[PDB]
Amino acid sequence: NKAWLKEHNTVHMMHPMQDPKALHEQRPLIIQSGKGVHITDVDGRRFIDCQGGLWCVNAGYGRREIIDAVTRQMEELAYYSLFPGSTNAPAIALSQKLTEVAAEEGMVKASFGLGGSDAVETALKIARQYWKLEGQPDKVKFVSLYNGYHGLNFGGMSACGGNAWKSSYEPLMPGFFQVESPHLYRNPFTNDPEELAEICAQILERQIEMQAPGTVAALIAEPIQGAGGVIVPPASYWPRLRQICDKYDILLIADEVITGLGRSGSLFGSRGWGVKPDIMCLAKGISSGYVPLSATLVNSRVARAWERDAGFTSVYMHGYTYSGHPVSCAAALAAIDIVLQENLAENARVVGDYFLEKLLILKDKHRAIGDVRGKGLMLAVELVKERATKEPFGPADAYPLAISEACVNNGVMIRTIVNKLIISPPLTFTTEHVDEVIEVLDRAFVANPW
Amino acid sequence: NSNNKAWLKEHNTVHMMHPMQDPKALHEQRPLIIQSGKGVHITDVDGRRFIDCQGGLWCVNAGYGRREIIDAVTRQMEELAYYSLFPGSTNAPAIALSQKLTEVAAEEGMVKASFGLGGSDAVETALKIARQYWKLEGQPDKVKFVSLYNGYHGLNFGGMSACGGNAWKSSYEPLMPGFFQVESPHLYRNPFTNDPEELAEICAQILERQIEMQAPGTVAALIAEPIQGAGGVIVPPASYWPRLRQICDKYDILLIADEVITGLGRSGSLFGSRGWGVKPDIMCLAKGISSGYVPLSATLVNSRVARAWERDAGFTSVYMHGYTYSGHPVSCAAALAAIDIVLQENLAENARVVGDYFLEKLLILKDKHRAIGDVRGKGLMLAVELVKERATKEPFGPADAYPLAISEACVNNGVMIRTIVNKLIISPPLTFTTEHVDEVIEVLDRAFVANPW
Amino acid sequence: WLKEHNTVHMMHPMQDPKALHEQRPLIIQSGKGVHITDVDGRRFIDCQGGLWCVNAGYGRREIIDAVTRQMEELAYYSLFPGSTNAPAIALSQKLTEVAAEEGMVKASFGLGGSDAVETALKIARQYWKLEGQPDKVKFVSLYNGYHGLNFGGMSACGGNAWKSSYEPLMPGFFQVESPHLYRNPFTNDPEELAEICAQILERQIEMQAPGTVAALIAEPIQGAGGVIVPPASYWPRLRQICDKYDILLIADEVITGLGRSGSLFGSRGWGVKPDIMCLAKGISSGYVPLSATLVNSRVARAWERDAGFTSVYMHGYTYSGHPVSCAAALAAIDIVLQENLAENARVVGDYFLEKLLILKDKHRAIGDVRGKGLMLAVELVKERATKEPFGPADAYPLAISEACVNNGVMIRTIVNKLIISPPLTFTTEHVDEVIEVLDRAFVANPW
Amino acid sequence: KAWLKEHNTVHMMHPMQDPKALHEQRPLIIQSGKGVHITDVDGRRFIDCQGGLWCVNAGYGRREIIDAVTRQMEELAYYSLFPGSTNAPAIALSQKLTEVAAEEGMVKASFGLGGSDAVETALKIARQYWKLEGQPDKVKFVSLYNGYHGLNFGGMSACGGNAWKSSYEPLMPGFFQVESPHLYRNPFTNDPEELAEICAQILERQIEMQAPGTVAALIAEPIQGAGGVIVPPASYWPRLRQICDKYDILLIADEVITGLGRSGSLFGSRGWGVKPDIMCLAKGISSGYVPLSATLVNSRVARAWERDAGFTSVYMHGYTYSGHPVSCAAALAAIDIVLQENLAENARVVGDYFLEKLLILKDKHRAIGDVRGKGLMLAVELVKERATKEPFGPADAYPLAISEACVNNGVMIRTIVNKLIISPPLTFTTEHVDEVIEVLDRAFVANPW
Ligand SMILES: *Cc1c(COP(=O)(O)O)cnc(C)c1O
């Protein structure tokens, strides 16, 4: 019951991303239930969930379609592997559905996992094996971007573009390099986004040339950087990435764990930039968070390498016990059907557009707002101590937490990443939900002048 | 489409990268599409029924069709499908499961749980915890990991780097620096001795000497399975793990017990390490922790480890690890129900007893059939190792036909047993009975009779 | 047994063995002043200065006699536990004297630039372990940097030519944009280029987390990278950055050390005091192999900590402090100081660069001319508007080089760049001779 | 002379030492050498059992080498082997080395300046070789416990003792060290033939575990020097050659000490009847008169570069002073001395005599746990108790007491922890042996244990 849960909250847990010392006195809310876009804690406090779980409950809470798919599959066959000798029906169905839905990008095969970190890990392993199959085993290095976030296994962590995720676990993998990215609001080059895109592309090219292209396997990048603070690159940037990868003969890995299946207002973030990656990483929203599932998709160029007469090198020696878990796959199938039938990519585009417009008005109103960024239903409000210098609030400062808490205490679940308020609701959000959130945020800023 | 047999058959493997396999092989040799499971049996799309000696993949420990787990899952999914343990929030099944796991592993001294989704995550988490632990304790040079020949620790770059068989490693090199593997006490294939106690002591001394060579001040942890699973069901001598604990105490490195297979009963004790009377510093759990019904893993730590975060160490004491689906309320609901099943039906004891019986019956098979070079087991993990000649122990290769013939003769007579190279692997649900044992042994015997060597 | 065995039993440095079957190198037999003579009596002005190293010229009785006298007295004894030797002690004091402006108080000896760099890298790592920050293990360096050939130095190089055949190299070595005005994607303003490259360096350090970074290593003027002189503001910014992020500044002075760039040290030429300095090549005028890695008081004092085994310096080669090498270096350093060759390099190099700019005006193939003191390069391009370089396979640069060699001037190429690094005793008359021959080479090979 | 004493250690980073120790315990300033004797600045004369540092193999004051050096420096002090040029002493020395190492199949030399350079060169050569042969995954190096392979990052990563490694971590990925057949200290057996076979099988299984397709080479010393003069069983190195052949990895012989005679054969590998793929030489190659190293390769390795492989066939290695004409002139004179005076045979005979005398000493004094030697490479290992083989630690006084008694009675012998190391010039005589043995005997008598 409630008292037991409150007593035991955090005591036997290593909570992600937190210092356990802070949790002795500052206990997290015990979220008890969800319906639609709202969540309710054990004490009955109700919120609009602007976190959307954690960028993943894209279809909303309480979807009977997914619950029923999960129950029926688990009643019939709770588990069987895709390891030598067997497969299962939901995994087959989901594999075909994914090659269908990502046909535009040229995806022809799926490798399943359980979350975004393993989707990324799978992608990195695939790239290395691909080049060994292609008779270029020196191609082993990975390039990624400043502010990129690619998950927490040693591979993805080595590919991350912020040291916060890396420093305590060093030394990380050799051969991982990060380069300047087109973050307009904080860059040393220019206030022109097209010039910024081009200078960042050329920096990337010159680092690749420095490494020797014959030693580089792939570039990995998010179409829109999520955990790095919702950084939307200039539209010319990703086409340049595709050109650079073609030029130096390295793979383009699109980390679509957040942008996959609609959030940024296109069915894929790459598609939103009109770019076809070689490899795509999907997780989070692909199952609406109801059951863990990830998928790494590859194109024919990549897949055909395993059709070489290469002996043991053509054995795909990867894949997790729960790869293709039939309950995961059932959930993912129902969620993708919802995404398509209700055109949540378009709803994200429109409601996200409206949301972004209202935030821009809010920015003019409240001096602590240094920057507002968004595409579809991924948005961030960046708070600064001084607009002229763009000096950020530190993790230690109180103001971001004050704004967050004023929202939370008035029924709007918005949390921070350092100095940035992050907005990533379910893709079923309405303009009315937007107006509610904007009203509460406005009141929060009014009550906390800067 | 998930109910359309001819569709399933025509799209089987076409759009998928199957684990551990050459896609060239799958155009003509199509895997069985398993459609349903009940108890210890599974049924394919064509209605063929099998005793599932794979136990899914060492993980359906409670059996198929368990209403307890199904209902727990449904009810939790109706209430709250998901919410994170990230700054600001938690959920009730995650709190409950964290407390349950520390209770069940009280004997080993486990006080905190870090959740993930599968064994590879559990291992990666253990490795990250060890490195951060030693930075917290003011010894940041302690970064190296030692593991064992034939060890399997999953497939992310960390775990893969810790594996003791190159099959999982070579296509993805170069792997992580600072991972070293040493001689392990594999009685059937070792260059030292036919005496198991002498083998344990020599392997212990070899380990010590490699640690000393690395300099202990650069080594963070030893990782090892209480009984090696994918390496081919290799049961160490009883003295080995107590020596491992002693070696770790002597050199001041952490002992990580990879219990992804042995955790929660399969080897005939609730934990493999407990089976050896050893308390690890960190325990990796997955697979059977949820009976395979929903992906879940847990990495447990003792007080010694957890308290390193209880210091003013600035940003070094922020645990910057944890997966989006860490603590998934549905996964945790499933794991709570499976653990209640394991405890209430004493599946650790059933694994112990029925496994002892299974191993005895396997020795009869070894007596009759020349190709069986070795039979191994503890609790309900067993292997039958096939060799071309017993005097030399020359193994069948992955390319050879005999192991596969024995397997197919079983599958075609209602017994799902597959191979890892030259070894037939047996890891059924822990609810297996002695009568199930005899059914499988009769089928296996007939397979060997039909395939003389 | 010389022309018949030339290259036959040899793995020649920096070369494709396929090329050596087709055309064999000149067997150089003798040297005098700034001239060299081959086995057939062909005489050349040596614009290579051996290999950036015969800084005092050939045939210096001062150095030859120092060497003979020492080898007659004591050919060798080590600096290992229990022993030392006199020339090593003397050279130690001389180096701390000469580099007093930079704050250098200790030297670790070696045999060449690669070991000097390896020594600096090991010192930096051990320093941070002594200072209680063992996570500080990564190294940052510059595009076009050249830091020798052992695995550390090779890892630190900023050109892939030295790297790709030996991969995978050391983890934790990162290279960043450097201010090469002639070829950069940012600006043609050198002050703006210096500042943008400094900010790029800062942001890469921050990306790595400064607590994982040990040191920056850089050449005051980049040599093998093609004689790239940075803007004057750049190195003060490097010192500022290293102070801000608490990483060591390693100055690779293997070429610029002891006068070639027109200051006794390149870092001095920029008014910057490094934490660690690498010296080789010209330190002994190439007469006997010798290198020295110097450290300041900040670095040295870390070993005075009660740190147990961490404070044992487990580095140093058999021939560290070789008495003959040290005697040769003492004589060469005396010559550098006695004849003020740093000032001569400054003045005659200024003159050389002026003459080269006139040549640039005259001949379309010269895209850029660069120099500081007596390190100069003429960079040849297929079209100046695009700066398209000649490739290693192209004939024109080798044609110019061969016309010089066939007219008594030893100038070789680094790809599309003619490199000039003569002895520091070079005169304006030597300059005019070389310039006339170069001019006729261009006239005879019109572009 | 007074200035030498005042500035001793003051401006210097002394190898292998804590600088705090050097403020008060100053090293002896060695001033001159003749024959096998050295003299310090105070006129104290010593028999140099260090042979400089395993390197003054022809003795001190050799007119042949001094004159070769002087005349060469008089003619041409330096010119490079870099694109466009070469020099005569370099050509001559390459041919001489290919002739002297003909038995081993050595056909090409890449020159350097010291043993660390020779090892680094071997490692780079191996990696580039396998890339040329179309197997670029072959990058890992296996070496032996107690192996010493110099101090650059590659060689340091290959070392088999952590003392050289821990202060500079993290070292290179892909370097692995295995059990070696050190009879005196091993967990397996007191039978050397059995020890050789078990260590060979441990090496095989580690290679197999790594996957042979990822391993470039094994590097090992025919007799381990800095690790404490560890002589392997005679069967071991033939097994090493068999293993390298079986798994298709290169065998690198680190002959920096054993090269050119010290162990009683012209090469240690020859002493074991084994032909390596790559050989590392330094130290004695020039009798220590001028810094020089050479890395030799056989036809198997060399032919890889004769391929149309584009840039991969460019040897982008070689130091400024590779093939330094003065160094090469010195080495040619030193090799001439080694051959004409058959110093390999003298090392064999006088070393066997030396080892016999040391065994008598072991019978005499309980502090001696073990005596080891081949040719003029010998060690006396001191232990606090023979039954347990408990060593003296670096902190203990007894080994230093024995060493100081020898030094104070005219015999220059130093320690590596608990081991007295003996490596005199290869011109050592039986008379010299008896001189040293008398002094050592009295040192032990004066310091009973
Ligand atoms: C002494 C030694 C080295 C070190 O060589 P340096 O000349 O000191 O660089 C390397 N390898 C072996 C086998 C040695 O004996």
PDB file of C-alpha atoms in Angstrom, chain C residues 5-6 8-18 21 25-26 28-31 36 46 48 51 53 58 64 68 71-74 76-77 79-84 86 89 92-93 106-107 109 111 114 118 122 125-126 129 149-151 154 161-162 165-168 170-171 281 286-287 289 303-306 309 311 313-319 322 410 412, chain D residues 4 7-8 11-20 23 27-28 30-33 48 50 53 55 60 63 69-70 75-79 81-86 90-91 94-95 98 107-109 111 113 116 120 124 127-128 131 151-153 156 163-164 167-170 172-173 283 288-289 291 305-308 311 313 315-321 324 412 414:
ATOM      1  CA  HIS C   5      74.666  -2.899 -52.311  1.00  0.00           C
ATOM      2  CA  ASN C   6      72.890   0.526 -52.130  1.00  0.00           C
ATOM      3  CA  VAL C   8      69.646  -3.861 -51.230  1.00  0.00           C
ATOM      4  CA  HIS C   9      69.817  -4.777 -47.535  1.00  0.00           C
ATOM      5  CA  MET C  10      67.886  -1.719 -46.343  1.00  0.00           C
ATOM      6  CA  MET C  11      64.417  -0.638 -45.270  1.00  0.00           C
ATOM      7  CA  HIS C  12      64.858   3.031 -46.172  1.00  0.00           C
ATOM      8  CA  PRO C  13      62.930   5.479 -43.920  1.00  0.00           C
ATOM      9  CA  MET C  14      59.797   7.207 -45.242  1.00  0.00           C
ATOM     10  CA  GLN C  15      59.873   5.519 -48.666  1.00  0.00           C
ATOM     11  CA  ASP C  16      58.106   2.978 -50.838  1.00  0.00           C
ATOM     12  CA  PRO C  17      60.581   0.134 -51.573  1.00  0.00           C
ATOM     13  CA  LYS C  18      59.107  -0.123 -55.092  1.00  0.00           C
ATOM     14  CA  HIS C  21      64.582  -0.389 -57.364  1.00  0.00           C
ATOM     15  CA  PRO C  25      69.666   7.415 -53.829  1.00  0.00           C
ATOM     16  CA  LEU C  26      72.859   9.418 -54.118  1.00  0.00           C
ATOM     17  CA  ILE C  28      76.865  11.119 -50.168  1.00  0.00           C
ATOM     18  CA  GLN C  29      80.513  10.673 -49.174  1.00  0.00           C
ATOM     19  CA  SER C  30      81.751  13.840 -47.443  1.00  0.00           C
ATOM     20  CA  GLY C  31      80.749  17.212 -46.065  1.00  0.00           C
ATOM     21  CA  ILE C  36      78.199  17.888 -49.378  1.00  0.00           C
ATOM     22  CA  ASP C  46      73.045  21.224 -48.614  1.00  0.00           C
ATOM     23  CA  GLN C  48      68.474  20.005 -46.248  1.00  0.00           C
ATOM     24  CA  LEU C  51      67.735  16.586 -41.966  1.00  0.00           C
ATOM     25  CA  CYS C  53      69.981  18.933 -37.933  1.00  0.00           C
ATOM     26  CA  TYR C  58      80.015  20.076 -41.568  1.00  0.00           C
ATOM     27  CA  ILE C  64      84.907  16.254 -33.781  1.00  0.00           C
ATOM     28  CA  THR C  68      87.262  11.897 -30.082  1.00  0.00           C
ATOM     29  CA  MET C  71      85.473   8.405 -26.593  1.00  0.00           C
ATOM     30  CA  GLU C  72      89.188   8.030 -25.845  1.00  0.00           C
ATOM     31  CA  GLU C  73      88.447   8.891 -22.210  1.00  0.00           C
ATOM     32  CA  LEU C  74      85.195   7.010 -21.518  1.00  0.00           C
ATOM     33  CA  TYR C  76      80.095   4.862 -22.276  1.00  0.00           C
ATOM     34  CA  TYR C  77      78.625   4.549 -18.838  1.00  0.00           C
ATOM     35  CA  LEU C  79      72.848   6.949 -15.668  1.00  0.00           C
ATOM     36  CA  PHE C  80      71.127   3.892 -14.139  1.00  0.00           C
ATOM     37  CA  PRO C  81      71.087   3.219 -10.339  1.00  0.00           C
ATOM     38  CA  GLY C  82      74.548   3.667  -8.857  1.00  0.00           C
ATOM     39  CA  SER C  83      76.311   5.560 -11.649  1.00  0.00           C
ATOM     40  CA  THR C  84      76.446   8.746 -13.743  1.00  0.00           C
ATOM     41  CA  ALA C  86      80.545  13.807 -16.361  1.00  0.00           C
ATOM     42  CA  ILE C  89      76.001  16.248 -15.706  1.00  0.00           C
ATOM     43  CA  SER C  92      72.206  18.892 -17.741  1.00  0.00           C
ATOM     44  CA  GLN C  93      73.430  22.160 -16.176  1.00  0.00           C
ATOM     45  CA  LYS C 106      65.384  19.167 -15.220  1.00  0.00           C
ATOM     46  CA  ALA C 107      66.232  17.137 -18.319  1.00  0.00           C
ATOM     47  CA  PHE C 109      67.908  12.380 -22.044  1.00  0.00           C
ATOM     48  CA  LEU C 111      68.591   9.653 -28.586  1.00  0.00           C
ATOM     49  CA  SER C 114      60.726  10.377 -31.201  1.00  0.00           C
ATOM     50  CA  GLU C 118      57.662   9.627 -25.876  1.00  0.00           C
ATOM     51  CA  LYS C 122      55.141   9.479 -20.146  1.00  0.00           C
ATOM     52  CA  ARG C 125      50.902  10.944 -17.430  1.00  0.00           C
ATOM     53  CA  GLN C 126      53.037  10.159 -14.397  1.00  0.00           C
ATOM     54  CA  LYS C 129      49.129  10.403 -11.286  1.00  0.00           C
ATOM     55  CA  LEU C 149      57.372   7.702 -34.853  1.00  0.00           C
ATOM     56  CA  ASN C 150      57.022   5.668 -31.682  1.00  0.00           C
ATOM     57  CA  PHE C 151      53.498   4.660 -30.812  1.00  0.00           C
ATOM     58  CA  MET C 154      52.776   8.543 -33.825  1.00  0.00           C
ATOM     59  CA  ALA C 161      50.499   9.533 -43.599  1.00  0.00           C
ATOM     60  CA  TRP C 162      52.483   8.524 -40.503  1.00  0.00           C
ATOM     61  CA  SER C 165      49.686   1.578 -41.799  1.00  0.00           C
ATOM     62  CA  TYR C 166      50.175   0.944 -38.051  1.00  0.00           C
ATOM     63  CA  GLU C 167      46.610   1.301 -36.721  1.00  0.00           C
ATOM     64  CA  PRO C 168      45.047   0.931 -34.267  1.00  0.00           C
ATOM     65  CA  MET C 170      46.914   4.787 -28.850  1.00  0.00           C
ATOM     66  CA  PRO C 171      43.440   5.558 -27.458  1.00  0.00           C
ATOM     67  CA  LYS C 281      68.342  17.021 -34.079  1.00  0.00           C
ATOM     68  CA  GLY C 286      73.694  15.901 -35.984  1.00  0.00           C
ATOM     69  CA  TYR C 287      77.238  14.773 -35.177  1.00  0.00           C
ATOM     70  CA  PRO C 289      72.480  11.172 -31.825  1.00  0.00           C
ATOM     71  CA  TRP C 303      58.132  13.554  -7.898  1.00  0.00           C
ATOM     72  CA  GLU C 304      58.997  15.054  -4.509  1.00  0.00           C
ATOM     73  CA  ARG C 305      55.710  13.694  -3.155  1.00  0.00           C
ATOM     74  CA  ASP C 306      55.416  10.814  -0.713  1.00  0.00           C
ATOM     75  CA  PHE C 309      56.109   3.448  -6.211  1.00  0.00           C
ATOM     76  CA  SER C 311      57.247   8.448  -7.580  1.00  0.00           C
ATOM     77  CA  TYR C 313      60.605   7.387 -12.637  1.00  0.00           C
ATOM     78  CA  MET C 314      60.513   4.064 -14.519  1.00  0.00           C
ATOM     79  CA  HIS C 315      61.721   5.588 -17.787  1.00  0.00           C
ATOM     80  CA  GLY C 316      65.112   6.273 -19.391  1.00  0.00           C
ATOM     81  CA  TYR C 317      67.020   4.415 -22.083  1.00  0.00           C
ATOM     82  CA  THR C 318      70.311   2.528 -21.982  1.00  0.00           C
ATOM     83  CA  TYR C 319      72.013   5.384 -23.836  1.00  0.00           C
ATOM     84  CA  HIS C 322      75.595   8.831 -23.444  1.00  0.00           C
ATOM     85  CA  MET C 410      70.423  19.775 -52.608  1.00  0.00           C
ATOM     86  CA  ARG C 412      64.144  17.723 -51.819  1.00  0.00           C
TER      87      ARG C 412
ATOM     88  CA  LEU D   4      80.957  17.546 -11.509  1.00  0.00           C
ATOM     89  CA  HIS D   7      75.957  19.306 -10.200  1.00  0.00           C
ATOM     90  CA  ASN D   8      75.593  15.466 -10.049  1.00  0.00           C
ATOM     91  CA  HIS D  11      69.387  18.934 -13.228  1.00  0.00           C
ATOM     92  CA  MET D  12      68.593  15.329 -14.120  1.00  0.00           C
ATOM     93  CA  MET D  13      65.767  12.778 -14.276  1.00  0.00           C
ATOM     94  CA  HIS D  14      67.698   9.614 -13.474  1.00  0.00           C
ATOM     95  CA  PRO D  15      66.263   6.363 -14.953  1.00  0.00           C
ATOM     96  CA  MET D  16      64.545   3.797 -12.714  1.00  0.00           C
ATOM     97  CA  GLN D  17      64.775   5.877  -9.518  1.00  0.00           C
ATOM     98  CA  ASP D  18      62.940   8.054  -7.014  1.00  0.00           C
ATOM     99  CA  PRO D  19      64.580  11.523  -7.235  1.00  0.00           C
ATOM    100  CA  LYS D  20      64.090  12.069  -3.477  1.00  0.00           C
ATOM    101  CA  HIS D  23      69.659  14.184  -2.837  1.00  0.00           C
ATOM    102  CA  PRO D  27      75.828   7.974  -7.839  1.00  0.00           C
ATOM    103  CA  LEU D  28      79.493   7.373  -8.571  1.00  0.00           C
ATOM    104  CA  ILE D  30      82.642   7.211 -13.676  1.00  0.00           C
ATOM    105  CA  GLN D  31      85.427   9.065 -15.479  1.00  0.00           C
ATOM    106  CA  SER D  32      87.389   6.614 -17.566  1.00  0.00           C
ATOM    107  CA  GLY D  33      87.640   3.035 -18.891  1.00  0.00           C
ATOM    108  CA  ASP D  48      83.091  -3.497 -14.639  1.00  0.00           C
ATOM    109  CA  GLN D  50      77.962  -4.309 -15.630  1.00  0.00           C
ATOM    110  CA  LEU D  53      74.863  -1.732 -19.247  1.00  0.00           C
ATOM    111  CA  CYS D  55      76.679  -3.226 -23.965  1.00  0.00           C
ATOM    112  CA  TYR D  60      86.934  -0.067 -23.240  1.00  0.00           C
ATOM    113  CA  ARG D  63      91.495   1.830 -30.983  1.00  0.00           C
ATOM    114  CA  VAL D  69      84.500   6.889 -35.528  1.00  0.00           C
ATOM    115  CA  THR D  70      87.025   9.700 -35.776  1.00  0.00           C
ATOM    116  CA  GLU D  75      84.777  12.608 -43.653  1.00  0.00           C
ATOM    117  CA  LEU D  76      80.988  12.952 -43.227  1.00  0.00           C
ATOM    118  CA  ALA D  77      79.435  13.422 -39.783  1.00  0.00           C
ATOM    119  CA  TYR D  78      75.855  12.798 -40.920  1.00  0.00           C
ATOM    120  CA  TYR D  79      73.515  12.381 -43.813  1.00  0.00           C
ATOM    121  CA  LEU D  81      68.564   7.750 -45.447  1.00  0.00           C
ATOM    122  CA  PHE D  82      65.424   9.810 -46.227  1.00  0.00           C
ATOM    123  CA  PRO D  83      64.096  10.326 -49.808  1.00  0.00           C
ATOM    124  CA  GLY D  84      66.945  11.061 -52.202  1.00  0.00           C
ATOM    125  CA  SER D  85      69.986  10.136 -50.108  1.00  0.00           C
ATOM    126  CA  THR D  86      71.906   7.383 -48.310  1.00  0.00           C
ATOM    127  CA  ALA D  90      74.923   2.459 -43.592  1.00  0.00           C
ATOM    128  CA  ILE D  91      75.054   0.418 -46.817  1.00  0.00           C
ATOM    129  CA  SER D  94      73.315  -3.525 -43.734  1.00  0.00           C
ATOM    130  CA  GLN D  95      75.260  -5.958 -45.878  1.00  0.00           C
ATOM    131  CA  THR D  98      72.608  -9.669 -43.517  1.00  0.00           C
ATOM    132  CA  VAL D 107      67.760 -10.101 -45.557  1.00  0.00           C
ATOM    133  CA  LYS D 108      66.915  -6.508 -44.566  1.00  0.00           C
ATOM    134  CA  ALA D 109      67.734  -4.028 -41.789  1.00  0.00           C
ATOM    135  CA  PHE D 111      68.142   1.075 -38.258  1.00  0.00           C
ATOM    136  CA  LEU D 113      69.237   4.276 -31.978  1.00  0.00           C
ATOM    137  CA  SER D 116      63.391   0.576 -27.461  1.00  0.00           C
ATOM    138  CA  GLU D 120      58.998  -0.337 -31.718  1.00  0.00           C
ATOM    139  CA  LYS D 124      55.312  -1.428 -36.559  1.00  0.00           C
ATOM    140  CA  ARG D 127      51.431  -4.594 -38.183  1.00  0.00           C
ATOM    141  CA  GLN D 128      52.269  -3.173 -41.585  1.00  0.00           C
ATOM    142  CA  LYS D 131      48.112  -5.197 -43.618  1.00  0.00           C
ATOM    143  CA  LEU D 151      60.218   1.896 -22.796  1.00  0.00           C
ATOM    144  CA  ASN D 152      58.325   3.448 -25.669  1.00  0.00           C
ATOM    145  CA  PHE D 153      54.582   2.898 -25.531  1.00  0.00           C
ATOM    146  CA  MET D 156      56.318  -0.826 -22.627  1.00  0.00           C
ATOM    147  CA  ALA D 163      57.073  -2.088 -12.684  1.00  0.00           C
ATOM    148  CA  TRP D 164      57.689  -0.524 -16.108  1.00  0.00           C
ATOM    149  CA  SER D 167      52.868   4.696 -13.822  1.00  0.00           C
ATOM    150  CA  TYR D 168      52.025   5.264 -17.503  1.00  0.00           C
ATOM    151  CA  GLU D 169      48.682   3.441 -17.822  1.00  0.00           C
ATOM    152  CA  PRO D 170      46.530   3.071 -19.780  1.00  0.00           C
ATOM    153  CA  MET D 172      48.264   0.080 -25.694  1.00  0.00           C
ATOM    154  CA  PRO D 173      45.234  -2.157 -26.393  1.00  0.00           C
ATOM    155  CA  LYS D 283      73.544  -2.332 -27.055  1.00  0.00           C
ATOM    156  CA  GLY D 288      78.188   0.911 -26.601  1.00  0.00           C
ATOM    157  CA  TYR D 289      80.604   3.389 -28.179  1.00  0.00           C
ATOM    158  CA  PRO D 291      74.123   4.697 -30.041  1.00  0.00           C
ATOM    159  CA  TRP D 305      56.428  -4.635 -49.394  1.00  0.00           C
ATOM    160  CA  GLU D 306      57.168  -5.741 -52.981  1.00  0.00           C
ATOM    161  CA  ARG D 307      53.399  -5.733 -53.664  1.00  0.00           C
ATOM    162  CA  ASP D 308      51.360  -3.212 -55.629  1.00  0.00           C
ATOM    163  CA  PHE D 311      50.256   3.735 -49.887  1.00  0.00           C
ATOM    164  CA  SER D 313      53.540  -0.334 -49.138  1.00  0.00           C
ATOM    165  CA  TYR D 315      57.355   2.277 -45.058  1.00  0.00           C
ATOM    166  CA  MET D 316      56.475   5.429 -43.088  1.00  0.00           C
ATOM    167  CA  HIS D 317      58.944   4.590 -40.309  1.00  0.00           C
ATOM    168  CA  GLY D 318      62.597   5.345 -39.714  1.00  0.00           C
ATOM    169  CA  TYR D 319      64.222   7.999 -37.549  1.00  0.00           C
ATOM    170  CA  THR D 320      66.279  11.062 -38.449  1.00  0.00           C
ATOM    171  CA  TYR D 321      69.402   9.227 -37.254  1.00  0.00           C
ATOM    172  CA  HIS D 324      73.832   7.490 -38.839  1.00  0.00           C
ATOM    173  CA  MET D 412      81.285  -3.047 -10.044  1.00  0.00           C
ATOM    174  CA  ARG D 414      74.737  -3.753  -8.965  1.00  0.00           C
TER     175      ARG D 414
END
